[PDB]
Each structure stands twice: as C-alpha cells, then as structure tokens.
Design a protein around this nucleic acid. Structure first.
Ligand SMILES: [Mg+2]
Ligand SMILES: [Mg+2]
Ligand SMILES: [Mg+2]
Ligand SMILES: [Mg+2]
Ligand SMILES: [Mg+2]
Ligand SMILES: [Mg+2]
Ligand SMILES: [Mg+2]
Ligand SMILES: [Mg+2]
Ligand SMILES: [Mg+2]
Ligand SMILES: [Mg+2]
Ligand SMILES: [Mg+2]
Ligand SMILES: [Mg+2]
Ligand SMILES: [Mg+2]
Ligand SMILES: [Mg+2]
Ligand SMILES: [Mg+2]
Ligand SMILES: [Mg+2]
Ligand SMILES: [Mg+2]
Ligand SMILES: [Mg+2]
Ligand SMILES: [Mg+2]
Ligand SMILES: [Mg+2]
Ligand SMILES: [Mg+2]
Ligand SMILES: [Mg+2]
Ligand SMILES: [Mg+2]
Ligand SMILES: [Mg+2]
Ligand SMILES: [Mg+2]
Ligand SMILES: [Mg+2]
Ligand SMILES: [Mg+2]
Ligand SMILES: [Mg+2]
Ligand SMILES: [Mg+2]
Ligand SMILES: [Mg+2]
Ligand SMILES: [Mg+2]
Ligand SMILES: [Mg+2]
Ligand SMILES: [Mg+2]
Ligand SMILES: [Mg+2]
Ligand SMILES: [Mg+2]
Ligand SMILES: [Mg+2]
Ligand SMILES: [Mg+2]
Ligand SMILES: [Mg+2]
Ligand SMILES: [Mg+2]
Ligand SMILES: [Mg+2]
Ligand SMILES: [Mg+2]
Ligand SMILES: [Mg+2]
Ligand SMILES: [Mg+2]
Ligand SMILES: [Mg+2]
Ligand SMILES: [Mg+2]
Ligand SMILES: [Mg+2]
Ligand SMILES: [Mg+2]
Ligand SMILES: [Mg+2]
Ligand SMILES: [Mg+2]
Ligand SMILES: [Mg+2]
Ligand SMILES: [Mg+2]
Ligand SMILES: [Mg+2]
Ligand SMILES: [Mg+2]
Ligand SMILES: [Mg+2]
Ligand SMILES: [Mg+2]
Ligand SMILES: [Mg+2]
Ligand SMILES: [Mg+2]
Ligand SMILES: [Mg+2]
Ligand SMILES: [Mg+2]
Ligand SMILES: [Mg+2]
Ligand SMILES: [Mg+2]
Ligand SMILES: [Mg+2]
Ligand SMILES: [Mg+2]
Ligand SMILES: [Mg+2]
Ligand SMILES: [Mg+2]
Ligand SMILES: [Mg+2]
Ligand SMILES: [Mg+2]
Ligand SMILES: [Mg+2]
Ligand SMILES: [Mg+2]
Ligand SMILES: [Mg+2]
Ligand SMILES: [Mg+2]
Ligand SMILES: [Mg+2]
Ligand SMILES: [Mg+2]
Ligand SMILES: [Mg+2]
Ligand SMILES: [Mg+2]
Ligand SMILES: [Mg+2]
Ligand SMILES: [Mg+2]
Ligand SMILES: [Mg+2]
Ligand SMILES: [Mg+2]
Ligand SMILES: [Mg+2]
Ligand SMILES: [Mg+2]
Ligand SMILES: [Mg+2]
Ligand SMILES: [Mg+2]
Ligand SMILES: [Mg+2]
Ligand SMILES: [Mg+2]
Ligand SMILES: [Mg+2]
Ligand SMILES: [Mg+2]
Ligand SMILES: [Mg+2]
Ligand SMILES: [Mg+2]
Ligand SMILES: [Mg+2]
Ligand SMILES: [Mg+2]
Ligand SMILES: [Mg+2]
Ligand SMILES: [Mg+2]
Ligand SMILES: [Mg+2]
Ligand SMILES: [Mg+2]
Ligand SMILES: [Mg+2]
Ligand SMILES: [Mg+2]
Ligand SMILES: [Mg+2]
Ligand SMILES: [Mg+2]
Ligand SMILES: [Mg+2]
Ligand SMILES: [Mg+2]
Ligand SMILES: [Mg+2]
Ligand SMILES: [Mg+2]
Ligand SMILES: [Mg+2]
Ligand SMILES: [Mg+2]
Ligand SMILES: [Mg+2]
Ligand SMILES: [Mg+2]
Ligand SMILES: [Mg+2]
Ligand SMILES: [Mg+2]
Ligand SMILES: [Mg+2]
Ligand SMILES: [Mg+2]
Ligand SMILES: [Mg+2]
Ligand SMILES: [Mg+2]
Ligand SMILES: [Mg+2]
Ligand SMILES: [Zn+2]
Lengths: 118, 137, 122, 59, 204, 74
RNA sequence: AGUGAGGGCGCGAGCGAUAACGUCCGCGUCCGAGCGCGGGAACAACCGAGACCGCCAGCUAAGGCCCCCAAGUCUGGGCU
RNA sequence: GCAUGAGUAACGAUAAAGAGGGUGAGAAUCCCUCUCGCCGUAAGCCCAAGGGUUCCUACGCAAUGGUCGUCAGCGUAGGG
RNA sequence: GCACCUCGAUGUCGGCUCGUCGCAUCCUGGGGCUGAAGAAGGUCCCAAGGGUUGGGCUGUUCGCCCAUUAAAGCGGCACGCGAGCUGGGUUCAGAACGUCGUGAGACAGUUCGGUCUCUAUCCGCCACGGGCGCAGGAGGCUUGAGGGGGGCUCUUCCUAGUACGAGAGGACCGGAAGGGACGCACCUCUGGUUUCCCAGCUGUCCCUCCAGGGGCAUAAGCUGGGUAGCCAUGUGCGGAAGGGAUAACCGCUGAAAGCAUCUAAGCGGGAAGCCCGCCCCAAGAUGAGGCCUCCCACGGCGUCAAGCCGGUAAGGACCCGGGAAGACGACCCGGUGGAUGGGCCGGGGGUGUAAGCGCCGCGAGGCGUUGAGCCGACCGGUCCCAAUCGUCCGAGGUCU
C-alpha cells in the first residue's frame, strides 16, 4: 500500500540505490547529457537539480555539502564555477528529460536522455 | 481550495497565547482544573518536561515527577482551556528533544546529566527586568 | 491494561506485597483491566505475619497502571508501577492505609475509602 | 503440497480459446512534423532529433 | 429528507464544556439544485445536486444543456438526495442545526488486494511451533465429499476498501456558514479531499 | 446414573483411536465414580462397571455398618 | 467344449433379533447371456414382451387419457 | 513421431551496479576509461594427484553458453 | 451385525484454522401448570436470531479441578476440515524394564529416539478485466426485481423499600445511566512503525596533513528520536425505534348441540423469531428498465441483404503527466485556454545549537555566533523542467 509515500526503489536496496543516484549525478555533471532508462532518469532529475541549486548558493557550507555526494574536488569546482552561474537567473528546474524513440534490445527497456539546460 | 488553511482557521478560536515558552529539560508547574464531584479546584503538578510533541493547535507535552516514592507522568494539551496557568521553575539543557531515558534512571544521576541552562535563564531576567518598563510611567 | 498473569504491587498494608491477576471482574469475557476495575488475584509474595498469606486468593482494585489512561478532557496520566488495593467482597479495603498516589478515576468510580486513605490523588 | 496435476489433456478448442487475448496491438505513431517520417508520440524522432520543433540531438 | 454534498477536508479536535471532542471538518456549502424528480414523471422524489465550480472549457455539450436548463452554470459533480424538496434554490450548510444528528457517506480508503488476515480478521497461522509456510494463510475452506464444494460468500482474500460506506448517527458538533464548514463528532469514511454526502439520520 | 462413552487411552491404533470403547459410570446421590477402559468391548466394560460399582456402593457402605457397630459396642 | 465366484424376486423351512441389499437349503422364475424394446420419474432381474432387415400403415399389452406428455378436464352413484 | 500442462515454473546463492567513448549488419552482455560494491588464512599466490591442447596467435558465430554475443574453456589454421 | 463400492491406495487420534447445517434449546425472547405470596425455582409448550470465557493436569477426545458467566447446549457435516498447518498419539527399522517363550522373537503392557511432496488442468469459491448484447449515436443522473450484511448481552439507578410478605427479603409495568464481547469506519488524541528526515558513536580504509566529509561493518554498522502514510491498545458510530403478518398462548362475539365452547362463518391481542424497516451489491432484471441534456436525413453503390460501404457529427479510445485508485487491466484527476508530476519557495513538522571564525583551557573540551544547520511524503504557492506535435474511432436509425 504505497499510499501517499513518494520515492522509488528501482529493485535496489538503500545503499545501492543511493550510490546509483550519485554515479549518475556524477556522470551527468561530467558529460552534460546522459542516457538511461525512463524511470532512473525521472528520479535522478531532482537529485542533480538539488545539487545545482546548492552550488548556486556558493558558500563553503554549500560546497561542503555537494562534496558529500560528488566526492571529487575538481568536479565540485566545475559545478560552482561554470554550471551554477549559468542558472543564477533561472530558479528551480535545471535539467530536462526526454524520451527516446528507439528502445533497448535484449530487454526492450525504454530509454530517455537527461541533459541539463543552458 | 485550501483544506490545510481551513483547519488552521477553525482551531484559531480555541488557541491560547498567554502560555510561556519551554523546552524539554525545563522544570515546570502546571495549575490544572479538576472536579472533585461538585467542586472545581485547581490542582498543581510540577516536574521536568520530558517531551513536547508539536502539531499546532493539537500540540501536547509531557511532564514527569516522582510522588510519594513513585513516578508519574501526565500529558497536557498546550491549549486546554482547563489549564489555568503554567510556570517556569527551572530550566535545564537537554542534548536531545525527547528525554525518556531518565525514566530508568536515578535522581542524583538525573541531577548532573541534566544541566541548568544558565543561558536561557539570563534571557528571562532580560525579559523580567525589562518587563518592569511598564511600572515606569 | 492488566490481564491474567499480570503481576501487581500492593497499594496498602494488607500484609500482601505482590499479587498476580488471575481473572478480571468486568464482563462475561473482558480482555484487560485498568484503573477503577476490580480483579481477582493471587498473592505471590507477602511479608510475614501480615493479614493475608502466601497463596491467598483475593479481590482487589487497580489504582495505578503503566499504560497511560485517557481522560475526557484529553489529558492523560501514567504511573511507573502497576498497583492495586486488596479489598473484601463488600469491596472495602481490607487494608487501612494506601501508599503512593492513585488515579482520580477511583473516586469517579466511588472508591471513596481509598482516595481518602490516599496520600495524593491525581 | 501433494503436488497437483492436470486431470485431462486440455482440448484443442479450449486452449486456442484461452489464447483469445494474446494478440498484439500495433504501435501507436505520429509523423515527425519536419520529416513526416513515422515515430511514436512524446519521443524524440530518431530521424532528425527534433521535439517541440527544436533540434535536440544531432541525428 | 434533507441532505447535502461536501468534502472531507480532515479532522482535528476541539473543546466543549471543558471536555475535548474529536471532530471532522467538512466543506459543504453551497449546492445549487440541478433538477427536481417528480413522482409523476420520474417515479419518485429527489433532487439532483451540484457541487464544486467547473471550468466551462471542460463542460461538454450535452452537459451544458442540462446545466443551463435549470439556469445554473457549470459544476463538477452531480448527485441525488432522495426524498428532498428544497424550498429555495441553492441548498446550504445552514440547513443543519448544531446538535442534530447525521448519516455520512463516503468511499472508504483503498487497501487494494487484501490478505484474509487483514480484510476478514482471520487469526491465521501460529508464528512458531511447526508452521510450514502458513504463518498467515486462511487454513481450511471446506468439508469433504459432502457438500463437495465451497459455498458462495465464503470469506476469502480479495479487494478491500475503496467502497461505498455510510456511517450512522453522527453528532453535528458545529457549522460556520460564512465558511460553509461543518463539524461532525467522529469518523467520516474516506480520505481528505474525498467526496462525502451528509443527511439527517434515520435514528430516533 | 450417568453413563459415559469415550475413546480409550493407550496403544491400539485404528480400531481404538477410532472407537469409543471406554466406559465411565457415575452414581449421583452417593458420589462414586468408576470407569472401565479394561477390555476391548464396551458392553462388557459397561457391565463390569455396573457391578464393580455394585460392590463399590453396597460393599462400601457395609463399612458404615461395622463402624457404627464397633464404635457403639466400644 | 465351457462351467464348477452366481444373483434378485415369489413361496416353503433352518440360522439371525418374525434385523439386514444377511446367511443356508428346497421349488419356481427372471437377470446372468435380454444393461435390446413399452410402463414403473430415474432404477440388471417389479408389471408387459423374447428385437432377422425395411415402412411418414394398422390392433393391442402393462400403464395411462389437465399442461410438461400420446389419449376423456368422458358418463352415471357415493365418500374424504 | 508429435501433442497437453504453457508462453506457465525456471534461467543455479540477495558480493551490485552506473555512465561516457569505441567496434560491429546488429550490443544492458565484447573492448577502453571513469565512478560504485565484494573477497583479502581468499574469492590472491605456489606445489602435487587428476584432466590431456583446454595454453599463445590470427580468422569466425551454426551449434555449445539456461538470454544476448562482435565475446568464450566454442569452430578453423598455425604456433608453442 | 452384514461384507454391497473402493487393496494398479478413500492418509487413520488429538490440537489449529476456517467454519456451516440440525433443534430433541445452554443463554437471552414468548408462554401454560405449579406443592406460583413476593423474589426465586420446578416442569412443559413456542422459538435456531444471535450468544455460548480464560486457565491448571494429561497426546488426549473425555473427564476433574481454578476464577469468572446471561450461558459456559448437545449433534451432523468421511466421529467436517493433513493437494490448509501441525505430528504430541498411533502403526517401520534402533534400544530398555516388566512379561511369555529353551529360542529366534513376542504383548497391546510400558518407556527414550524416529524424512509429512515448491508449480491447480476441470468444478467450486474469492477478487478483477476483455468481447458481444441491450434493433438509432452518445454525455450524465438513476429505479430496485433479485441477492448480501446485520440481528448478542449484563449491571446499577429511578419508579418504590411501594404492591407482597410476620419477617427476611422484594417486584410487574413504565423510564434512566454505565459496561463486556463483536462489527464498520477513522488517524484529531494515546500508542506503534517510520531502510536514510535529523543526531550521536566504534573500528577501519579513503579523499587532503589539520579541520571537514565519504565507504564498509545487514540485505540500515550501532545507538537515540521521528512527519506523512499504514495502523490497535487509540476516537467515532452500529445492533435499534417503529410498521405488518404470526408461534405457542390469552380472548370477544357464536351456532351446530335451548345450556355450553376462542371457531365451524367474523373479530381482537400476542415473540430476541417472520415480512418489511437500517447499511451494501445490484437492469447480462436477455424481462437488458427510467429521467435530464446532446447528435443527425445517405454522398456513391447493394436483384434478393432487414446489406457492404465512406469522410464527418455529438461524443469516445489512443498517447503522456499523475493518483490514499491499483497485481495487470480497470477507475479518477490532468495535459500549455495547464498547477498533473518535478525542482524552487513558503507554512507545518522532525531534529536540537551545523560549517567557519572569535574568546576560555596545557588538554580532552567548553563558551559565544546559534533554536543554528540540515531538513522524505503532509498543507499551499509557483510555467523553471516535464504533460511537444499529433493519430484513430465514432452519424446518418429494419420496422404492421
Ligand atoms: Mg507496503
Ligand atoms: Mg503529491
Ligand atoms: Mg506523492
Ligand atoms: Mg536490480
Ligand atoms: Mg476564539
Ligand atoms: Mg524608558
Ligand atoms: Mg476489545
Ligand atoms: Mg506456600
Ligand atoms: Mg475473598
Ligand atoms: Mg479505554
Ligand atoms: Mg490522606
Ligand atoms: Mg496527607
Ligand atoms: Mg494484448
Ligand atoms: Mg493481509
Ligand atoms: Mg480466532
Ligand atoms: Mg491461537
Ligand atoms: Mg456557530
Ligand atoms: Mg490407561
Ligand atoms: Mg484385559
Ligand atoms: Mg450402632
Ligand atoms: Mg471339462
Ligand atoms: Mg468342480
Ligand atoms: Mg440359479
Ligand atoms: Mg434362484
Ligand atoms: Mg415367526
Ligand atoms: Mg433404461
Ligand atoms: Mg443392442
Ligand atoms: Mg425397462
Ligand atoms: Mg442386465
Ligand atoms: Mg429363449
Ligand atoms: Mg387396459
Ligand atoms: Mg409421455
Ligand atoms: Mg367434471
Ligand atoms: Mg367421474
Ligand atoms: Mg347416462
Ligand atoms: Mg510472454
Ligand atoms: Mg504472462
Ligand atoms: Mg530452478
Ligand atoms: Mg556504447
Ligand atoms: Mg593458482
Ligand atoms: Mg586424492
Ligand atoms: Mg572422467
Ligand atoms: Mg574475430
Ligand atoms: Mg554462436
Ligand atoms: Mg548466434
Ligand atoms: Mg538449470
Ligand atoms: Mg563482427
Ligand atoms: Mg579454441
Ligand atoms: Mg490441548
Ligand atoms: Mg480454540
Ligand atoms: Mg460451531
Ligand atoms: Mg467445531
Ligand atoms: Mg426445553
Ligand atoms: Mg419430565
Ligand atoms: Mg448455534
Ligand atoms: Mg429451519
Ligand atoms: Mg479455555
Ligand atoms: Mg474451559
Ligand atoms: Mg480419561
Ligand atoms: Mg461434552
Ligand atoms: Mg462430527
Ligand atoms: Mg460412524
Ligand atoms: Mg508411529
Ligand atoms: Mg518403536
Ligand atoms: Mg513415543
Ligand atoms: Mg519429532
Ligand atoms: Mg488458478
Ligand atoms: Mg485457471
Ligand atoms: Mg464484463
Ligand atoms: Mg429501500
Ligand atoms: Mg423476475
Ligand atoms: Mg439475512
Ligand atoms: Mg427503595
Ligand atoms: Mg427494608
Ligand atoms: Mg432491609
Ligand atoms: Mg421498560
Ligand atoms: Mg464512565
Ligand atoms: Mg458498546
Ligand atoms: Mg541523507
Ligand atoms: Mg577514522
Ligand atoms: Mg559514513
Ligand atoms: Mg532509527
Ligand atoms: Mg508518522
Ligand atoms: Mg481495549
Ligand atoms: Mg456504542
Ligand atoms: Mg436488540
Ligand atoms: Mg391486512
Ligand atoms: Mg363466550
Ligand atoms: Mg355466553
Ligand atoms: Mg367464556
Ligand atoms: Mg389472531
Ligand atoms: Mg400485532
Ligand atoms: Mg447504490
Ligand atoms: Mg443536410
Ligand atoms: Mg443502389
Ligand atoms: Mg455505418
Ligand atoms: Mg494514464
Ligand atoms: Mg498509472
Ligand atoms: Mg471500460
Ligand atoms: Mg484540479
Ligand atoms: Mg505549446
Ligand atoms: Mg502543484
Ligand atoms: Mg509541484
Ligand atoms: Mg517551525
Ligand atoms: Mg555552539
Ligand atoms: Mg560550532
Ligand atoms: Mg554532520
Ligand atoms: Mg573549539
Ligand atoms: Mg530550525
Ligand atoms: Mg528562526
Ligand atoms: Mg530549502
Ligand atoms: Mg530530499
Ligand atoms: Mg504535494
Ligand atoms: Mg496534495
Ligand atoms: Zn524528424
């Protein structure tokens, strides 16, 4: 009875699911756009969206929080110095998700890309 | 349509204001109105607040005192029209917001691991010594 | 919330110290008793030479439980021990002095003997 | 479990009768407004990379 | 036989004569009548009732003719109060005095597929002592060659909740027309924001 | 008299767990109870009860006779 | 050659409890092999009757003749 | 020889995955990098018995691989 | 007792779970007789609607006993129920006592130990869809044939210490309150939970040495708390009232039969039961119902078709965002003429004084900044991101 609860499990337990959310956030900040399944994407969306808007603050605390997920010092710099100032005048919603007409093959999963906006 | 607001509405006309502020760790006297058959008298009850659970008009809190060799806890709603007044007597510093563990515990043990909050007591003199700025004109 | 096998404490000098509820007089098949409720119990532990003895079966009323009891005002009250007063079949205290506070509900259920014997009702 | 088991060979007319619902449903599709090629709704047309009239990926 | 449509908005509790009472707050007013049901033309007696304002660019044609025919603009849900004949047009909250008693009707919470142990309260299996994987199953369902079957109505697992439920004789604790709110002592079925119906009880 | 059939207790299998061969009889105004899971029958245990309880009531009461005789002579 | 497990019903006896769709003999019959046909709702052995094949022809049998369902809501006298 | 159960159980330890790039008729499954998790008195090394080309190199996917397969302890040929 | 079906198998005791049917009634309901003063009880008739406790002993059914109860009813259903559980009993091998036999072994005598099989094809049953039908096409709102559920009970008080009785005791009738158990709903309150919402902690490895974080110790490493949701111990409400026809039983009138009789014609009273009444399903009610509104003439063909057509109509499905709806379908809301999901914002709420720096201290630490920092769902805002764009289907009505 899922009533009013909202999260997702993705057939992964808590530890794993978390890591997944990072390694995807990670890669998303790295390459700008990535392509995963429609559900992972739908969820992942807000995770990066949260980190972006955290960077947008700028302070050391903010930097000391985003680092807790991204772990990597350089990708943190990359976040704060280029990505975030792109968005100082767009509040909320820093990423988009779009569905892909071609499916997967050996499991026929649906596919979607997640690029951040400009 | 805001249902959330609509509730905050209705309750508003039962809400007290007058009641002091307090935290778990505080020791506190509550004048309570009870009936002894016919009469309606005011029975006090002071002790260490152990738990305040908040939900607006429905916010409630718990006080624990030992009496005649055995401990009681009583729970009061923080807007019962049957509370006459509540009194700060002493203020402590809990590290946490729910202080159950002091049940299974001694009175001289509780004495030290609940430290008097000198800070917040000072702001009360601040309140009170400046509260005599009405009797000034 | 006392039921069969629930041990209780003595509120008074009945010679008894520990009783264990063995039945609850409050229905054809009531599940648990609380404050104001009479229960039938057995003495499991009691001091020497007091009135009742080890093995006596007794009538008693519960004066203090441990599961917080609701009030009509929306207050609630809860004591540390589960405690009762041993009484006779006229439902009079076989004791003469209760010790430690007793839930006001005893008065509300007419146990006027106890609540006067009581050191503190709350 | 004492291991249940079929009583009688399911008749020809009875199995096909069950498969009444098995039939597939053709994909639902729309022209891509630029290339007019066939493509499922709400996905980015794999022929050019346009959705919402904007080039979205460089097909 | 009075009645009125409304929303379960959620319950809290209040105070009365130094006693606390759980209520349950219900937005209800107003309600524009939509149609009269003649005993002559329809066979019986009732009133088609409107509730909650409707965005007209969502009102289809056949509905828009219904609505205008009683001179009343768009509305979201239409229901019937059986054996009610409102004097004035719109039906209000004000048609209940506080103290009066009511039957509430709702569509209970939705527990989807339901265990027997939940829906029907079977005691199911012993948690230890030998249970080969029935720690929660329904056990026996029959006899033997006589009767040679299971009988209709046998309590079994399946969908539970999300269903019409009326709860009887509830006390109208209060009502504030200015807000169209209703107070009902006790538990109305269904979720907050769910549609309820309230009428005068059938008790003495 | 209260007659009583019930499944006998012990070793016996299918024609004993599944055959109420045991008897018990009870004389109400006196109080004596006897029973007979003594034999695989039921009628034979029935009567064997209703003559053991023959003695067990009259051969038992003869004590009350002698007790009085003896005490009153003493 | 096969058979040497018979059965049911009527009658006549023993056994049994003037029990059993019990059992065992005797005299009959039928099923067995006629679970082919008509009645008995259904119903091996009860009532009718021993089917070579054909018929969109006639008489009867037991059993029936208000509708299911072929034939009298027949006729005359009674009772419940 | 072919059906039925049935496109149903099952796909063989709940140590775990994610992404970008690449190759290819074709990629969740092959190659490369980055992050992530597991073993670490082994789930890493080295002997022996047993196995007998399974070793290295090219080329390759019908079958074997509980799916895929461009990959393989698979097939071909050479080498060792 | 018989030996008619089953030995190319119909698993036997007791417990558990789920029950349902019988009435020869254990309880409450109605009633006659009483050796019925009252209060009780006895016995009989009516009545099956619901109700029928928890423990000690034993494998036990049975029975005894403890404390209660309105009562702790008996029986059928393969002494209901092992393709539902159990496996203590009993009936495999092992072994001991008593015991019989020279003996190997044996007993119905005892005692310790002793493998209970993942996949439901049909019927049945609980839940949910697909197709077609409803002789015009559609959006709604409905009637209730026919079913289902429910149906219990105690205690105190008033009436009144009255009628009754020497007393002790102690009512009818009429009216009030508080309970036990059971049912449905709910999450305000109490109380659980709350797999990452906050915090503390130990080892260790890592980032970056300090500081500050991360990973692993579970599939949360451990601890301390905990919204929303889902919940019972928690809150609400339910059984009725009443209307009708009756059971046993009590009657009025009244012949046969001058009297007489409750009955033969006619009528009255009368049950927790019967029919309604309350809650639920329900027009596949093929007997397919009704009411409000909306859409319309056929463009071309078809010997006979009351047809096959072909764009469209009011409308509907697709698709996508979603949902206290949900296994899947279904259902409900929404799709830029938008607040549906997401991020942001704010309220609420949890947690309980973050990082950084300053002051105190040799130090561990403390103190200030600071109810700070972080802050999942709840209540609301908000076009920043995502519901882009589109496609399909659906009229034109046989008729005396
Ligand atoms: Mg769940
Ligand atoms: Mg939501
Ligand atoms: Mg949600
Ligand atoms: Mg997975
Ligand atoms: Mg006010
Ligand atoms: Mg001044
Ligand atoms: Mg209960
Ligand atoms: Mg002793
Ligand atoms: Mg006593
Ligand atoms: Mg309570
Ligand atoms: Mg005193
Ligand atoms: Mg005193
Ligand atoms: Mg399909
Ligand atoms: Mg369940
Ligand atoms: Mg149970
Ligand atoms: Mg149990
Ligand atoms: Mg008012
Ligand atoms: Mg024995
Ligand atoms: Mg013997
Ligand atoms: Mg003598
Ligand atoms: Mg011969
Ligand atoms: Mg011979
Ligand atoms: Mg012969
Ligand atoms: Mg013969
Ligand atoms: Mg004879
Ligand atoms: Mg025949
Ligand atoms: Mg023939
Ligand atoms: Mg014949
Ligand atoms: Mg024959
Ligand atoms: Mg012949
Ligand atoms: Mg004739
Ligand atoms: Mg015929
Ligand atoms: Mg005639
Ligand atoms: Mg005649
Ligand atoms: Mg004539
Ligand atoms: Mg398939
Ligand atoms: Mg499938
Ligand atoms: Mg397997
Ligand atoms: Mg690739
Ligand atoms: Mg090696
Ligand atoms: Mg070896
Ligand atoms: Mg070999
Ligand atoms: Mg190759
Ligand atoms: Mg291959
Ligand atoms: Mg291949
Ligand atoms: Mg295998
Ligand atoms: Mg290739
Ligand atoms: Mg090779
Ligand atoms: Mg037992
Ligand atoms: Mg039981
Ligand atoms: Mg029963
Ligand atoms: Mg039973
Ligand atoms: Mg009787
Ligand atoms: Mg008698
Ligand atoms: Mg019964
Ligand atoms: Mg009956
Ligand atoms: Mg019991
Ligand atoms: Mg018992
Ligand atoms: Mg016995
Ligand atoms: Mg019995
Ligand atoms: Mg039985
Ligand atoms: Mg039998
Ligand atoms: Mg055995
Ligand atoms: Mg043995
Ligand atoms: Mg044994
Ligand atoms: Mg065992
Ligand atoms: Mg099935
Ligand atoms: Mg099936
Ligand atoms: Mg259907
Ligand atoms: Mg009705
Ligand atoms: Mg009909
Ligand atoms: Mg019924
Ligand atoms: Mg009196
Ligand atoms: Mg008196
Ligand atoms: Mg008196
Ligand atoms: Mg009365
Ligand atoms: Mg009370
Ligand atoms: Mg109640
Ligand atoms: Mg976290
Ligand atoms: Mg460390
Ligand atoms: Mg960590
Ligand atoms: Mg925790
Ligand atoms: Mg919560
Ligand atoms: Mg309770
Ligand atoms: Mg109630
Ligand atoms: Mg009742
Ligand atoms: Mg009439
Ligand atoms: Mg008369
Ligand atoms: Mg007369
Ligand atoms: Mg008379
Ligand atoms: Mg009458
Ligand atoms: Mg009447
Ligand atoms: Mg309905
Ligand atoms: Mg025209
Ligand atoms: Mg033509
Ligand atoms: Mg057409
Ligand atoms: Mg959808
Ligand atoms: Mg959905
Ligand atoms: Mg549909
Ligand atoms: Mg809306
Ligand atoms: Mg647009
Ligand atoms: Mg919104
Ligand atoms: Mg939103
Ligand atoms: Mg706050
Ligand atoms: Mg500080
Ligand atoms: Mg600090
Ligand atoms: Mg921290
Ligand atoms: Mg410091
Ligand atoms: Mg804060
Ligand atoms: Mg603040
Ligand atoms: Mg924020
Ligand atoms: Mg979050
Ligand atoms: Mg929301
Ligand atoms: Mg909401
Ligand atoms: Zn295109």
């Amino acid at each position: 009875m899922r009533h009013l609860k909202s999260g997702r499990k993705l057939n992964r337990h808590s530890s794993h699911r978390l890591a997944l959310y990072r390694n995807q956030a990670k890669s998303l900040l790295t390459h700008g756009r990535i392509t995963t399944t429609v559900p992972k994407a739908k969820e992942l969306r807000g995770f990066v969206d949260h980190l972006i808007h955290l960077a947008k603050r700028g302070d050391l605390h903010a930097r000391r929080l985003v680092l807790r997920d991204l772990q990597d010092v350089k990708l943190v710099r990359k976040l704060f110095d280029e990505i975030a100032p792109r968005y100082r005048d767009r509040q909320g919603g820093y990423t988009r998700v779009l569905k892909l007409a071609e499916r997967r093959r050996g499991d026929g999963a649906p596919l979607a890309l997640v690029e951040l906006v400009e | 349509m805001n249902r959330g607001a609509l509730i905050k509405l209705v309750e508003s006309r039962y809400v007290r204001t007058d009641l002091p502020e307090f935290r778990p760790g505080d020791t506190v006297r509550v004048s309570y109105k009870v009936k002894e058959g016919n009469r309606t008298r005011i029975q006090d009850f002071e002790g260490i607040v152990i738990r305040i659970r908040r939900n607006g008009f429905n916010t409630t809190f718990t006080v624990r005192k030992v009496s005649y060799g055995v401990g009681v806890e009583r729970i009061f709603p923080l807007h019962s029209p049957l509370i006459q007044k509540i009194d700060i007597v002493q203020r402590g510093r809990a590290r946490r917001a729910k202080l159950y563990f002091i049940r299974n515990l001694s009175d001289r043990e509780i004495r030290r691991k609940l430290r008097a909050d000198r800070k917040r007591i000072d702001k009360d003199r601040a309140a009170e010594r400046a509260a005599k700025e009405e009797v000034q004109k | 919330m006392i039921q069969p096998q629930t041990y209780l404490e003595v509120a008074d000098n009945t010679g008894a110290r520990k009783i264990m509820c063995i039945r609850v007089l409050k229905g054809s098949n009531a599940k648990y008793a609380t404050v104001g409720d009479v229960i039938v119990a057995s003495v499991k532990e009691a001091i020497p030479r007091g009135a009742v003895k080890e093995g006596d079966v007794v009538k008693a009323v519960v004066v203090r439980t441990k599961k917080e009891v609701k009030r009509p005002d929306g207050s609630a009250i809860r004591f540390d021990d589960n405690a009762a007063v041993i009484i006779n079949n006229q439902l009079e205290p076989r004791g003469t002095r209760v010790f430690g506070p007793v839930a006001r509900e005893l008065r509300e259920k007419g146990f006027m003997k106890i609540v006067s014997l009581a050191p503190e009702v709350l | 479990a004492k291991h249940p088991v079929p009583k009688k060979k399911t008749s020809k007319a009875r199995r096909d009768a069950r498969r009444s619902h098995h039939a597939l449903t053709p994909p639902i599709l729309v022209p891509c407004p630029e290339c007019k090629a066939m493509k499922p709704p709400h996905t980015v047309c794999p022929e050019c990379g346009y959705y919402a009239g904007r080039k979205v990926l460089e097909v | 036989m009075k009645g009125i449509l409304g929303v379960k908005v959620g319950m809290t509790r209040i105070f009365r004569d130094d006693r606390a009472v759980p209520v349950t707050v219900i937005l209800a007013g107003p309600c524009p009548v939509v149609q009269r049901r003649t005993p002559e033309k329809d066979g019986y007696t009732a009133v088609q009732l409107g509730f909650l304002p409707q965005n007209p660019k969502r009102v289809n044609r056949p509905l828009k003719g219904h609505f205008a025919k009683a001179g009343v603009e768009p509305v979201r849900i239409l229901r019937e109060i059986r054996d009610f004949n409102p004097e004035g047009d719109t039906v209000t909250v004000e048609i209940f005095k506080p103290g009066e008693r009511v039957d509430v009707t709702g569509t209970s919470k939705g527990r989807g597929f339901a265990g027997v142990m939940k829906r029907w309260n079977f005691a199911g299996g012993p948690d230890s002592h030998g249970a080969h994987k029935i720690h929660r199953h329904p056990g026996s369902i029959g006899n033997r060659k006589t009767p040679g079957r299971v009988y209709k109505g046998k309590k079994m697992a399946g969908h539970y909740g999300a269903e019409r439920v009326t709860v009887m004789n509830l006390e109208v604790v209060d009502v504030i027309p200015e807000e169209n709110l209703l107070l009902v002592k006790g538990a109305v079925p269904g979720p907050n924001g769910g549609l309820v119906i309230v009428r005068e009880t059938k008790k003495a | 008299l209260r007659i009583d059939t019930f499944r006998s207790s012990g070793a016996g299998g299918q024609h004993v767990n599944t055959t109420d061969s045991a008897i018990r009889i009870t004389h109400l105004p006196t109080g004596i109870v006897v029973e007979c899971q003594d034999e695989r029958s039921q009628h034979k245990n029935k009567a064997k009860a209703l003559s053991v309880l023959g003695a067990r009531i009259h051969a038992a009461e003869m004590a009350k006779r002698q007790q009085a005789e003896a005490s009153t002579r003493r």
